[PDB]
Amino acid sequence: ASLIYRQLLTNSYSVDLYDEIEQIGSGKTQNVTINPGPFAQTRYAPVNWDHGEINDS
């Protein structure tokens, strides 16, 4: 019964087929690789509030 190990080693190539099968079976996702470089947050502006355009006559 020693030939079990010999047979498994010799026939091990079929695991490539098994890998292809499980690859086809598995669902897939992916990445949108993130950007670095938010090193400078930006404020709005120097903003001053005032009454609008008065309509004089």
């Binding site: 950007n35 470089g37 938010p38 090193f39 400078a40 947050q41 930006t42 006559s57």
Partner: protein, 49 residues
Amino acid sequence: AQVDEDIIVSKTSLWKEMQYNRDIIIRFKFGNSIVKMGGLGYKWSEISY
């Protein structure tokens, strides 16, 4: 110059968009301007907001 031209003043930055939903009490009083007319004092030239 009569030509297009661009630069970039500062690199990218983060901005969140958010909702502020407050209640407000606006109170106000109108304004009236009244002015005479050169004369005896019977003609009013302007009575306007």
